[PDB]
Motif scaffolding. Structure first.
Motif, PDB file in Angstrom:
ATOM      1  N   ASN A 231       6.321 -26.821  -7.983  1.00  0.00           N
ATOM      2  CA  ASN A 231       6.037 -27.733  -9.081  1.00  0.00           C
ATOM      3  C   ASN A 231       4.559 -27.684  -9.447  1.00  0.00           C
ATOM      4  OD1 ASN A 231       6.234 -29.711 -11.032  1.00  0.00           O
ATOM      5  ND2 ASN A 231       6.780 -31.370  -9.624  1.00  0.00           N
ATOM      6  N   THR A 232       4.286 -27.719 -10.753  1.00  0.00           N
ATOM      7  CA  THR A 232       2.910 -27.818 -11.220  1.00  0.00           C
ATOM      8  C   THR A 232       2.320 -29.190 -10.922  1.00  0.00           C
ATOM      9  OG1 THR A 232       3.590 -28.522 -13.430  1.00  0.00           O
ATOM     10  CG2 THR A 232       3.409 -26.158 -13.029  1.00  0.00           C
ATOM     11  N   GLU A 233       3.161 -30.223 -10.869  1.00  0.00           N
ATOM     12  CA  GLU A 233       2.689 -31.567 -10.560  1.00  0.00           C
ATOM     13  C   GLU A 233       2.491 -31.750  -9.060  1.00  0.00           C
ATOM     14  N   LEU A 234       3.484 -31.362  -8.263  1.00  0.00           N
ATOM     15  CA  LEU A 234       3.436 -31.538  -6.815  1.00  0.00           C
ATOM     16  C   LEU A 234       2.555 -30.451  -6.216  1.00  0.00           C
ATOM     17  CD1 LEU A 234       4.464 -33.137  -4.357  1.00  0.00           C
ATOM     18  CD2 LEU A 234       6.387 -31.537  -4.246  1.00  0.00           C
ATOM     19  N   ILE A 235       1.309 -30.801  -5.910  1.00  0.00           N
ATOM     20  CA  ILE A 235       0.376 -29.886  -5.262  1.00  0.00           C
ATOM     21  C   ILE A 235      -0.100 -30.522  -3.962  1.00  0.00           C
ATOM     22  CG2 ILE A 235      -1.839 -28.707  -5.437  1.00  0.00           C
ATOM     23  CD1 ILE A 235      -1.396 -28.659  -8.496  1.00  0.00           C
ATOM     24  N   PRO A 236       0.284 -29.989  -2.804  1.00  0.00           N
ATOM     25  CA  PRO A 236      -0.235 -30.514  -1.538  1.00  0.00           C
ATOM     26  C   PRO A 236      -1.716 -30.206  -1.370  1.00  0.00           C
ATOM     27  CG  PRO A 236       1.847 -29.382  -1.197  1.00  0.00           C
ATOM     28  CD  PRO A 236       1.405 -29.057  -2.592  1.00  0.00           C
ATOM     29  N   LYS A 237      -2.355 -30.993  -0.505  1.00  0.00           N
ATOM     30  CA  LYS A 237      -3.797 -30.915  -0.297  1.00  0.00           C
ATOM     31  C   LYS A 237      -4.221 -29.738   0.572  1.00  0.00           C
ATOM     32  N   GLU A 238      -3.277 -28.956   1.089  1.00  0.00           N
ATOM     33  CA  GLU A 238      -3.582 -27.838   1.967  1.00  0.00           C
ATOM     34  C   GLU A 238      -3.741 -26.522   1.215  1.00  0.00           C
ATOM     35  OE1 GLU A 238      -1.040 -29.955   2.494  1.00  0.00           O
ATOM     36  OE2 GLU A 238      -1.606 -31.048   4.312  1.00  0.00           O
ATOM     37  N   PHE A 239      -3.920 -26.568  -0.103  1.00  0.00           N
ATOM     38  CA  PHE A 239      -4.080 -25.305  -0.811  1.00  0.00           C
ATOM     39  C   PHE A 239      -5.559 -24.953  -0.940  1.00  0.00           C
ATOM     40  CE2 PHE A 239       0.134 -25.761  -3.359  1.00  0.00           C
ATOM     41  CZ  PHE A 239       0.837 -25.421  -2.219  1.00  0.00           C
ATOM     42  N   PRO A 240      -5.932 -23.702  -0.669  1.00  0.00           N
ATOM     43  CA  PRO A 240      -7.324 -23.289  -0.874  1.00  0.00           C
ATOM     44  C   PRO A 240      -7.642 -23.132  -2.352  1.00  0.00           C
ATOM     45  CG  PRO A 240      -6.007 -21.428  -0.150  1.00  0.00           C
ATOM     46  CD  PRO A 240      -5.116 -22.635  -0.064  1.00  0.00           C
ATOM     47  N   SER A 241      -8.796 -23.670  -2.751  1.00  0.00           N
ATOM     48  CA  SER A 241      -9.208 -23.654  -4.150  1.00  0.00           C
ATOM     49  C   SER A 241      -9.616 -22.247  -4.573  1.00  0.00           C
ATOM     50  CB  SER A 241     -10.356 -24.638  -4.382  1.00  0.00           C
ATOM     51  OG  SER A 241      -9.939 -25.970  -4.138  1.00  0.00           O
ATOM     52  N   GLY A 242      -8.675 -21.501  -5.142  1.00  0.00           N
ATOM     53  CA  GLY A 242      -8.850 -20.079  -5.350  1.00  0.00           C
ATOM     54  C   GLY A 242      -7.611 -19.316  -4.934  1.00  0.00           C
ATOM     55  N   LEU A 243      -6.519 -20.050  -4.730  1.00  0.00           N
ATOM     56  CA  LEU A 243      -5.246 -19.465  -4.320  1.00  0.00           C
ATOM     57  C   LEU A 243      -4.672 -18.599  -5.439  1.00  0.00           C
ATOM     58  CD1 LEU A 243      -2.974 -19.383  -2.174  1.00  0.00           C
ATOM     59  CD2 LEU A 243      -2.012 -21.409  -3.275  1.00  0.00           C
ATOM     60  N   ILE A 244      -4.513 -17.308  -5.164  1.00  0.00           N
ATOM     61  CA  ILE A 244      -4.023 -16.352  -6.150  1.00  0.00           C
ATOM     62  C   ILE A 244      -2.502 -16.417  -6.182  1.00  0.00           C
ATOM     63  CG2 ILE A 244      -3.872 -13.917  -6.778  1.00  0.00           C
ATOM     64  CD1 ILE A 244      -6.731 -14.895  -4.538  1.00  0.00           C
ATOM     65  N   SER A 245      -1.940 -16.626  -7.369  1.00  0.00           N
ATOM     66  CA  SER A 245      -0.495 -16.648  -7.538  1.00  0.00           C
ATOM     67  C   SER A 245      -0.118 -15.868  -8.789  1.00  0.00           C
ATOM     68  CB  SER A 245       0.045 -18.081  -7.629  1.00  0.00           C
ATOM     69  OG  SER A 245       1.450 -18.081  -7.824  1.00  0.00           O
ATOM     70  N   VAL A 246       1.097 -15.319  -8.781  1.00  0.00           N
ATOM     71  CA  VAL A 246       1.635 -14.553  -9.902  1.00  0.00           C
ATOM     72  C   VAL A 246       3.023 -15.093 -10.215  1.00  0.00           C
ATOM     73  CG1 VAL A 246       2.439 -12.314 -10.715  1.00  0.00           C
ATOM     74  CG2 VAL A 246       0.306 -12.458  -9.435  1.00  0.00           C
ATOM     75  N   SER A 247       3.223 -15.534 -11.456  1.00  0.00           N
ATOM     76  CA  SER A 247       4.515 -16.030 -11.907  1.00  0.00           C
ATOM     77  C   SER A 247       4.627 -15.828 -13.410  1.00  0.00           C
ATOM     78  CB  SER A 247       4.708 -17.510 -11.553  1.00  0.00           C
ATOM     79  OG  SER A 247       3.797 -18.324 -12.268  1.00  0.00           O
ATOM     80  N   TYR A 248       5.862 -15.872 -13.909  1.00  0.00           N
ATOM     81  CA  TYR A 248       6.132 -15.673 -15.328  1.00  0.00           C
ATOM     82  C   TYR A 248       6.049 -16.969 -16.136  1.00  0.00           C
ATOM     83  CZ  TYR A 248      10.902 -17.228 -14.096  1.00  0.00           C
ATOM     84  OH  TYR A 248      11.990 -17.941 -13.643  1.00  0.00           O
ATOM     85  N   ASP A 249       5.443 -18.017 -15.580  1.00  0.00           N
ATOM     86  CA  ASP A 249       5.299 -19.289 -16.277  1.00  0.00           C
ATOM     87  C   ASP A 249       4.240 -19.163 -17.368  1.00  0.00           C
ATOM     88  OD1 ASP A 249       5.536 -21.933 -17.034  1.00  0.00           O
ATOM     89  OD2 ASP A 249       4.776 -22.772 -15.158  1.00  0.00           O
ATOM     90  N   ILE A 324      -2.180 -16.703 -12.135  1.00  0.00           N
ATOM     91  CA  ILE A 324      -2.887 -17.971 -12.077  1.00  0.00           C
ATOM     92  C   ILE A 324      -3.688 -18.047 -10.783  1.00  0.00           C
ATOM     93  CG2 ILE A 324      -1.159 -19.123 -13.492  1.00  0.00           C
ATOM     94  CD1 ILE A 324      -0.146 -20.482 -10.926  1.00  0.00           C
ATOM     95  N   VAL A 325      -4.747 -18.852 -10.821  1.00  0.00           N
ATOM     96  CA  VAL A 325      -5.543 -19.193  -9.653  1.00  0.00           C
ATOM     97  C   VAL A 325      -5.645 -20.714  -9.577  1.00  0.00           C
ATOM     98  CG1 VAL A 325      -6.861 -17.034  -9.681  1.00  0.00           C
ATOM     99  CG2 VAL A 325      -7.734 -19.063 -10.879  1.00  0.00           C
ATOM    100  N   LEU A 326      -6.299 -21.194  -8.524  1.00  0.00           N
ATOM    101  CA  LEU A 326      -6.525 -22.618  -8.318  1.00  0.00           C
ATOM    102  C   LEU A 326      -8.012 -22.898  -8.482  1.00  0.00           C
ATOM    103  CD1 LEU A 326      -5.127 -25.289  -7.580  1.00  0.00           C
ATOM    104  CD2 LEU A 326      -5.753 -24.860  -5.210  1.00  0.00           C
ATOM    105  N   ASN A 327      -8.347 -23.858  -9.338  1.00  0.00           N
ATOM    106  CA  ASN A 327      -9.743 -24.183  -9.594  1.00  0.00           C
ATOM    107  C   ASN A 327     -10.249 -25.183  -8.554  1.00  0.00           C
ATOM    108  OD1 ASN A 327      -8.330 -26.438 -10.521  1.00  0.00           O
ATOM    109  ND2 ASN A 327      -9.066 -26.289 -12.635  1.00  0.00           N
ATOM    110  N   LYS A 328     -11.470 -25.681  -8.751  1.00  0.00           N
ATOM    111  CA  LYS A 328     -11.992 -26.753  -7.917  1.00  0.00           C
ATOM    112  C   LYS A 328     -11.423 -28.113  -8.291  1.00  0.00           C
ATOM    113  N   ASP A 329     -10.760 -28.221  -9.443  1.00  0.00           N
ATOM    114  CA  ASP A 329     -10.133 -29.456  -9.889  1.00  0.00           C
ATOM    115  C   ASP A 329      -8.665 -29.548  -9.487  1.00  0.00           C
ATOM    116  OD1 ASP A 329     -12.476 -30.411 -11.050  1.00  0.00           O
ATOM    117  OD2 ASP A 329     -12.060 -29.422 -12.965  1.00  0.00           O
ATOM    118  N   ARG A 330      -8.228 -28.696  -8.547  1.00  0.00           N
ATOM    119  CA  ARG A 330      -6.879 -28.699  -7.967  1.00  0.00           C
ATOM    120  C   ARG A 330      -5.798 -28.493  -9.028  1.00  0.00           C
ATOM    121  NH1 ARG A 330      -6.211 -27.257  -3.203  1.00  0.00           N
ATOM    122  NH2 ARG A 330      -4.376 -28.602  -2.904  1.00  0.00           N
TER     123      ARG A 330
END
Lengths: 641, 22
Positions: A231-249, A324-330
């Motif tokens: 989920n784009t809304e449900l983000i747990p706090k254990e993700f590193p800010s900079g997590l590389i992901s690939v999806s067709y979204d 997509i990546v993860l920014n510092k703003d989660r």
């Protein structure tokens, strides 16, 4: 034809724009009887799915079904696959859990999806790794199924690559970890890029264990597949800010354009199948109580230029991928888009994400600028056969402007070899740091233009970079503005002329007046150089005679010495020795070995108060004091005669 | 010796050689 589009959504996509999604569509109508039925359902249970399928199949024999979903329930796609297997009706998935990627479809089912597979996503991720030359990596696989095909696909892709990948052994999990035997395999990880293949529930425990290990560092990358990215809304706090992901979204292309393209593909297949056989629309009468279908026909399809052709397993040929990546703003920061064959990159310069959390002290990222010098920094093009720099070269970028009216330009990325490249590689072997190497765009080494520096001096003094691995002459004000390291090579100055010797050194009688000798000779230097400053501090009258004797280029002065457009030239010693050791003919003869000359050295300029200075001073004396510097001199110099 | 004390800039720059008699 008779096509029903039902949509299960909470995102308010109304029904009347779907009724308006039929008029301009199919402008050249080859089927005579085309009727679409748009329906919207809010409940997402399979009871209503079976009910509306049995209502629409009996509803005047509807042959096409298009469905999308807003939730993340992947069982709906399996239910629709079973319905398409039983009813023999081609059904398309559009969004959500009805369009998620599953393992293996069946030839008895005529259900089809869009997008890439896990193999094409792995190909895109290895293309990302290839474009950034991250060749040292690992692979961690859990007990999520389809994992042996994933490992075998990675092995066959490395075996079918121009890279020669450095792959560490596969860390295979067994159960929920005791953190006793799995930790032994986790401590074996010494690579940079960590490849993880798991579900969303185990990923939290794996990232928490890696954070407890300290294996979530700045160099320790994390690339995850699409199914763990939930989920784009449900983000747990254990993700590193900079997590590389690939999806067709993709948010730039909504559901309406995708269902319009799906209707175009369905009507194209129906129109091309109508020319082969007439009685193609044949559906089942009712749920209570076929030979020629489109299941083996629409492998070749292309609508409006976009090649949306299919594969023999149920996937597409040219999908649209999202990186997509993860920014510092989660938040999941959408960055990269995919072309039809190759990959596009919005951020060509890869961002560091130095602080994945607040409690991450890092001190190893170092920005390095350099200048093109032929025995030291050889800058060449990338290999067009591989789109990859050779192993003994390093990547670089340079902000080259397009035109002279505007100041906008492009960071062209090229390859670098030479001597200082070998020095930087051996420093990365010994000191074990990270470097950020790029080229200077302002110009030469440096010149104080009324208390304003330029070039590498302007990059180091104004602290936009850290140090310069490339060669640099050392004089008074350069040692005033920054701190140099220890020298490593004995490179003074010299004069190149055409055994007999005319000039003995700086005390030559030629250095007084060319009217004293009967041929009026000539000698100059390179413009904007520190040798000019050395002459102006030695003799201003020599600068006054050299003002009429200037030139432009080192190779230009070499051609002027070979043809006869120049008599003598003043430069450094070892670079002219290297240029004369590989010259055909060897007509130009050097003067002496640094006796009546400057006799200086080459150092590495660092900022005032850098903690790396003592380590670099130890590393240079380690590199010289074992014959390895002599090995590099044997590699990059040729002493003839 | 660089690990134990600090060094200055070198004033002499030379190498090594072999003393023989002819």
């Amino acid at each position: 034809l008779n096509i029903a589009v039902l949509l299960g959504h909470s995102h308010d996509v109304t029904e009347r724009e779907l009724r308006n999604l039929w008029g301009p569509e199919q402008a050249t109508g080859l089927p005579l009887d085309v009727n679409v039925v748009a329906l919207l359902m809010n409940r997402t249970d399979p009871k209503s799915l079976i009910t509306h399928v049995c209502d629409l199949m009996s509803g005047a024999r509807i042959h096409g079904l298009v469905f999308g979903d807003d939730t993340d329930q992947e069982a709906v796609a399996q239910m629709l696959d079973f319905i398409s297997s039983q009813t023999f009706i081609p059904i398309l998935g559009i969004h959500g859990g009805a369009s998620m990627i599953m393992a293996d479809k069946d030839p008895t089912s005529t259900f089809f999806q869009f997008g890439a597979s896990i193999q094409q996503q792995a190909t895109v991720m290895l293309k990302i790794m290839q474009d950034y030359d991250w060749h040292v990596f690992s692979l961690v696989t859990t007990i999520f199924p389809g994992y042996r095909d994933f490992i075998s696909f990675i092995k066959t892709t490395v075996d079918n690559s121009f890279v020669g990948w450095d792959m560490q052994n596969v860390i295979t999990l067994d159960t929920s970890f005791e953190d006793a035997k799995t930790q032994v395999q986790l401590k074996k990880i010494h690579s940079s890029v960590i490849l993880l293949y798991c579900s969303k529930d185990e990923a939290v425990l794996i990232l928490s264990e890696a954070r407890s290990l300290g294996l979530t560092g700045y160099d320790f990358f994390w690339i995850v597949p699409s199914l763990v990215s939930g989920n784009t809304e449900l983000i747990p706090k254990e993700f590193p800010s900079g997590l590389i992901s690939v999806s067709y979204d993709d948010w730039d292309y909504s559901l309406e354009a995708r269902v319009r393209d799906g209707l175009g593909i369905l009507t194209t297949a129906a129109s091309s199948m109508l020319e082969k056989f007439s009685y193609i629309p044949e559906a089942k009468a009712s749920c209570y109580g076929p030979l020629h279908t489109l299941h083996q026909f629409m492998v070749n399809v292309t609508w409006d230029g976009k090649d949306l052709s299919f594969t023999e397993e149920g996937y597409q040929v040219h999908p649209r991928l999202v990186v997509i990546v993860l920014n510092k703003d989660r938040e999941w920061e959408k960055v990269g888009k995919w072309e039809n064959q190759t990959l596009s990159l919005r951020h060509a310069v890869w961002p560091r994400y130095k602080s994945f959390s607040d409690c991450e002290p890092d001190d190893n990222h170092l920005s390095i600028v350099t200048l093109e010098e032929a025995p030291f920094v050889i800058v060449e093009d990338i290999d067009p056969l591989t789109e990859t720099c050779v192993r003994n070269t390093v990547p670089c970028r340079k902000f080259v402007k397009i035109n002279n009216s505007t100041n906008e330009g492009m960071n062209v990325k090229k390859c670098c070899k030479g001597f200082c490249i070998d020095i930087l590689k051996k420093l990365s072997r010994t000191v074990k740091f990270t470097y950020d190497l790029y080229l200077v765009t302002n110009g030469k080494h440096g010149k104080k233009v009324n208390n304003v520096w330029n070039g590498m001096i302007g990059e180091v003094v104004y602290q936009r970079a850290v140090m310069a691995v490339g060669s640099l002459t050392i004089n008074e004000e350069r040692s005033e503005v920054v701190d140099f390291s220890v020298p490593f090579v004995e490179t003074g100055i010299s004069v190149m002329v055409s055994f007999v010797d005319q000039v003995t050194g700086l005390s030559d009688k030629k250095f007084q007046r060319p009217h004293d000798y009967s041929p009026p000779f000539r000698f100059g230097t390179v413009p904007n150089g520190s040798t000019e400053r050395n002459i102006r501090n030695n003799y201003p009258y020599m600068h006054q005679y050299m003002t009429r004797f200037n030139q432009r280029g080192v190779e230009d002065a070499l051609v002027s010495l070979k043809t006869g457009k120049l008599d003598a030239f003043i430069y450094d010693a070892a670079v002219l020795n290297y240029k004369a050791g590989r010259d055909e003919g060897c007509k130009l003869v050097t003067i002496g070995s640094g006796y009546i000359f400057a006799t200086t050295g080459y150092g590495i300029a660092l900022q005032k108060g850098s903690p790396w200075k003592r380590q670099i001073d130890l590393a240079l004396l380690q590199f010289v004091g074992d014959g390895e510097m002599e090995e590099l001199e044997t590699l990059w110099l040729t002493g003839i005669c | 010796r660089a690990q134990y004390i600090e060094f200055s800039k070198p004033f002499k720059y030379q190498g090594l050689t072999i003393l023989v008699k002819k």
